[PDB]
């Protein structure tokens, strides 16, 4: 049981660290980029209507 438990805890902790460090920030950056792009298009539409 000691050996098996060591293995399982190791794998789960490794997966948690990976998800925390190299998954969430990537998606957050993607979301921010898309959010900026939407406003970028909105500005051009506004300018056309103004003209």
């Amino acid at each position: 049981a000691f050996i098996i438990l060591d293995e399982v805890i190791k794998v789960t902790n490794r997966r948690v660290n990976a998800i925390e460090h190299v998954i969430i920030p990537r998606t957050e950056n993607t979301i921010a980029y898309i959010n900026s792009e939407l406003d970028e298009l909105d500005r051009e539409e506004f300018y056309r209507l103004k003209k």
């Binding site: 490794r14 997966r15 990976a18 190299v22 051009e44 300018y47 056309r48 003209k51």
Partner: protein, 411 residues
């Protein structure tokens, strides 16, 4: 009623007439190893080099102007930093190339059109038509010329500025609706052709643009417009530049359409070139895929074959695809030297996979071979200009010694 002097004029917006267009089927030798090997160009073809905010996009142009095998060159600067011209008109009169003997000046072969980012805006457009009309003129005399355009996105910016000044509907990010037509009618002047006249001579023009997208994205309307019309494409990476890894080409996104029509040339000279190219590209792609998981699994469950694949990929990315710019040994890698290095690397990987195929552990082989890796990694230092047969024998014996060592070291 007609008297003709030694010169004549010509409108710049009307392409010079030609007898008939042909198909470009002769490679353009750049000197850079990666470009010649994986993404070749043909004498009479177009190209793009989308910059990424200072990733050595001048090294490529510098080398192309210095060592390309063309009878003339027309370097155009539109939106240039202005300081560069002061360097290109100082280096050339102090550098030489040999064609029918060593003729010390290269300036005798070049003309330059300069319009720095400071000079009036409206003259940016009139700096590329003037640039290419001269190239067409020199083509009419049956000479293979090559126009090396600087940032062509600055021309688009000037178009946007004047369009906005007049007052009219913008299409995308302010650019006028007719941007996509101005570019195509410019790139369409390239290509081999048979001149117009009696003595039946032939020439060519091979333009190589360089777009400068905002930020680093390839979604810029300028970028997405040229990729639709060009035939070759050479992305650029930022981190590779930040690590001092030149040339900084991105090998996963670039491509080249002149990859099969060169089969005639290869068969005439290098029958096994495309096979080696494909195998190397497969090696690199597999290495990328395998590394894609090690970032979150760790290099624990990697078989011997995967480890060898990653090792070979690192070796290639560190030796084969780094030109180190300027030196006495690797400044212009001829085609034959590149071919021999290609074959040597592929043979190394093949033998490494063969020995481990029979169960022999690769970990011991790592230091049992030892000298093989150093030999292949130092093969790039073989001095060119020493004779096609000179280094040919050295590269011939290198792989023989390697495979003999593998057979002996199979123990």
């Amino acid at each position: 009623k007609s008297d003709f002097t030694l010169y004549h004029t010509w409108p710049v917006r009307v392409p010079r007439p030609v007898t008939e267009k042909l198909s470009a089927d002769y490679p353009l030798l750049t000197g850079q190893r990666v470009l010649d090997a994986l993404f070749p160009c043909v004498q009479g073809g177009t190209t793009c080099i989308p910059g990424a905010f200072g990733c050595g996009k001048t090294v490529i142009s510098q080398s192309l102007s210095k060592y390309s095998n063309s009878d003339a060159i027309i370097y155009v600067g539109c939106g240039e930093r202005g300081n560069e011209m002061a360097e290109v008109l100082m280096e050339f009169p102090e550098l030489y190339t040999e064609m029918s003997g060593t003729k010390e000046p290269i300036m005798k072969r070049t003309t330059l059109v300069a319009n720095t980012s400071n000079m009036p805006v409206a003259a940016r457009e009139a700096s590329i038509y003037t640039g290419i009309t001269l190239a067409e003129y020199f083509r009419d005399q049956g000479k293979n010329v090559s126009m090396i355009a600087d940032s062509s996105s600055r021309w688009a910016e000037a178009l946007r500025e004047i369009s906005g000044r007049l007052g009219e509907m913008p299409a995308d990010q302010g650019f006028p609706a007719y941007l996509g037509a101005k570019l195509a009618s410019f790139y369409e002047r390239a290509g081999k052709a048979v001149a117009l006249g009696s003595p039946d001579r032939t020439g060519s023009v091979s333009i190589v643009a360089a777009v400068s997208p905002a930020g680093g994205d390839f979604s810029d309307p300028v970028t997405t417009a040229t990729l639709g019309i060009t035939q070759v494409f050479w992305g650029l990476d930022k981190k590779l530049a930040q690590r001092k890894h030149f040339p900084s080409i991105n090998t996963s996104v670039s491509y080249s359409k002149y990859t099969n029509v060169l089969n005639k040339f290869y068969d005439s000279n290098y029958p096994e070139f495309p096979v080696l190219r494909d195998r190397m590209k497969e090696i690199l792609s597999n290495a990328e895929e395998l590394e894609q998981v090690v970032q979150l699994v760790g290099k624990s469950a990697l078989s011997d074959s995967d480890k060898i694949t990653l090792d070979v990929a690192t070796l290639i990315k560190e030796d084969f695809l780094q030109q180190n710019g300027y030196s006495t040994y690797d400044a212009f890698c001829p085609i034959w030297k590149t071919f021999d290095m290609m074959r040597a690397f592929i043979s190394y990987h093949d033998e490494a996979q063969k020995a481990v195929a029979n169960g022999a552990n690769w970990s011991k082989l790592a230091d049992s071979t030892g000298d093989v890796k150093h030999a292949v990694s130092s093969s790039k230092f073989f001095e060119p200009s020493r004779g096609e047969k000179e280094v040919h024998g050295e590269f011939e014996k290198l792989l023989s010694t390697m495979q003999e060592r593998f057979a002996e070291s199979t123990d």
